[PDB]
Amino acid sequence: SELRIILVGKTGTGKSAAGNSILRKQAFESKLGSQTLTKTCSKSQGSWGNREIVIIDTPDMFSWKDHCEALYKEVQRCYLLSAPGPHVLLLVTQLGRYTSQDQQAAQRVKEIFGEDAMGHTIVLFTHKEDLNGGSLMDYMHDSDNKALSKLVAACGGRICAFNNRAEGSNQDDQVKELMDCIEDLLMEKNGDHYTNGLYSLIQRVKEFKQSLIKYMETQRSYTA
Ligand SMILES: Nc1nc2c(ncn2[C@@H]2O[C@H](COP(=O)(O)OP(=O)(O)O)[C@@H](O)[C@H]2O)c(=O)[nH]1
Ligand SMILES: [Mg+2]
């Protein structure tokens, strides 16, 4: 009966902080670019009015470019902790600052989780306070960022804004807006979570590794 959220996106966009805003506590550690990067998954637990909310905060290593060996066993761990599948993938971007590294992070989500995990993805904009009480929809309508338009469209126009430093009632207000989207998206899905061939495999570490390499390979075969 729980709700499963997986935080994804470029490093330093504010997803760990986003997890904290949603759960309304000190769950994951926010951190500057100066700090040491995470190689391991972290999970946390909360609730939003009779529904238990479960968040999985993926490591920064997921976004890394070249060969990292510790990647495969941590993708298995991320899959095992989100089993049997996430209801929502939460792609976190900084408002007004969507770059190549962001497009690249959005690619890795597709590569790892599946090309249609985007149909269970909501785009979360951080630094909401830069709108100055302005509409997030109106800012998106008048955006010249062509690559962000692609990502939002692939996510079915589902967008949201967060000020991760907001406290008290202002925090509830913005989290409700997200909880509205989740609710609306889940209605489109009839309460279903996202699953793939890899979640089915999880009902050892070697067989998953081999199955994950093959899966990721296929997801790149579409992108041609
Ligand atoms: N002003 C502002 N800063 C934010 C917001 N969200 C995150 N940050 C800051 O961005 C930095 C990186 O945050 P972090 O959660 O570690 O980003 P992550 O790498 O995506 O997990 C921290 O110093 C946060 O305080 C926001 O909505 N507004
Ligand atoms: Mg982080």
Side-chain angles (χ1 to χ4, degrees), residues 10-18 29-32 57 60 92 126-129 162-165:
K10 185 178 77 174
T11 315
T13 53
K15 49 218 177 82
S16 299
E29 201 205 7
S30 292
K31 120 225 159 211
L32 263 47
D57 181 33
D60 315 305
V92 181
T126 47
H127 292 72
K128 176 176 153 66
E129 68 280 355
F162 261 33
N163 180 352
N164 279 322
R165 303 171 315 184

Side-chain angles (χ1 to χ4, degrees), residues 24-49 51 53-185:
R24 289 165 300 151
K25 64 179 180 174
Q26 198 53 232
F28 322 98
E29 201 205 7
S30 292
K31 120 225 159 211
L32 263 47
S34 330
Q35 298 313 292
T36 162
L37 307 160
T38 57
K39 272 183 69 177
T40 188
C41 272
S42 49
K43 199 187 95 153
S44 199
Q45 199 98 353
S47 59
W48 179 268
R51 180 146 206 191
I53 309 300
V54 176
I55 293 177
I56 302 90
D57 181 33
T58 52
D60 315 305
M61 174 204 59
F62 277 15
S63 72
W64 295 351
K65 276 275 188 160
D66 275 35
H67 173 77
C68 186
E69 189 50 43
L71 193 97
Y72 307 108
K73 86 167 180 187
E74 270 292 328
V75 183
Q76 186 192 279
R77 201 200 154 206
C78 180
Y79 267 78
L80 232 141
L81 289 167
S82 61
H87 294 99
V88 179
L89 286 95
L90 216 68
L91 191 38
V92 181
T93 158
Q94 183 160 326
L95 189 75
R97 299 177 172 180
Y98 189 80
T99 64
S100 295
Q101 284 184 223
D102 283 282
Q103 300 166 37
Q104 232 130 37
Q107 219 78 258
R108 289 289 301 191
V109 177
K110 293 169 75 193
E111 200 179 344
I112 285 157
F113 300 106
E115 212 270 313
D116 280 301
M118 221 52 38
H120 269 100
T121 299
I122 295 165
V123 177
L124 186 65
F125 296 94
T126 47
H127 292 72
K128 176 176 153 66
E129 68 280 355
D130 294 74
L131 288 170
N132 284 100
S135 186
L136 187 264
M137 307 292 180
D138 191 48
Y139 185 90
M140 289 304 136
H141 188 266
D142 296 297
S143 184
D144 43 13
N145 197 311
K146 276 192 177 182
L148 187 52
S149 303
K150 263 195 175 174
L151 184 64
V152 169
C155 297
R158 302 177 292 266
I159 48 178
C160 202
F162 261 33
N163 180 352
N164 279 322
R165 303 171 315 184
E167 304 213 17
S169 63
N170 280 323
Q171 191 177 29
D172 290 354
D173 288 357
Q174 64 173 33
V175 176
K176 211 229 165 194
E177 255 153 51
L178 188 84
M179 290 313 179
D180 275 18
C181 282
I182 317 282
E183 184 193 337
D184 222 60
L185 162 63

